[PDB]
Design a protein around this ligand. Sequence first.
Ligand SMILES: CC(=O)N[C@@H]1[C@@H](O)[C@@H](O)[C@@H](CO)O[C@@H]1O
Length: 236
Amino acid sequence: MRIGILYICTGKYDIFWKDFYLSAERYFMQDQSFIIEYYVFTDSPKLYDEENNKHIHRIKQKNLGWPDNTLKRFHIFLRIKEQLERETDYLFFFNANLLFTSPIGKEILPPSDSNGLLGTMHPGFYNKPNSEFTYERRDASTAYIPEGEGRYYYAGGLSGGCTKAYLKLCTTICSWVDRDATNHIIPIWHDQSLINKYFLDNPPAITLSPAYLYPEGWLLPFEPIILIRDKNKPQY
Ligand SMILES: CC(=O)N[C@@H]1[C@@H](O)[C@@H](O)[C@@H](CO)O[C@@H]1O
């Protein structure tokens, strides 16, 4: 089975590629049945272990700056959609500063008879009531979610599923992003708002706990499986 990792590390975020990659080569899908393809969108000339591992696919991408780096995130995946359709069976997106600490296996693969989508609970909202979810509340936006509706507050730092269903998600959100641009709207706060809208219409087959998005330094009711490295640490 072929597992595709989508990874954007333009500008000052390629410092995060090395330790992410090593942790991933160690803890992520290390059953010999799986093969891992890294699709690394960056402006870096060379990536760590690129000359050794043929599954590291460097794709050229410039820094768009904030927020287009976060707003056109799914635009970036779809420029190589055909390559993904023939080389991968599952796709997973990870934030640059994410870090694996414990083994992860087939338990996070959405079953083929489901919608084949995976979402992850945001660490700042897992214990909050519906009334405090910061959804997009403007009916003029494609990311609109009325008050009282919604189940979880999903995050944008980790999402995926089977390649077909996920590219379908990429295609939809791009359209939502573009339609709002015309109507003179930037959805707030975008990396999570559009995906929370999509996961409302399409309740994901798998919902990961914030143990898969554990912010460094926090005290949460979970063992951290994936850590969100503090960006403001001096070593970065
Ligand atoms: C994992 C998670 O939810 N992280 C998101 C991620 O999208 C990041 O870019 C930033 C906001 O842009 O912080 C957020 O919490």
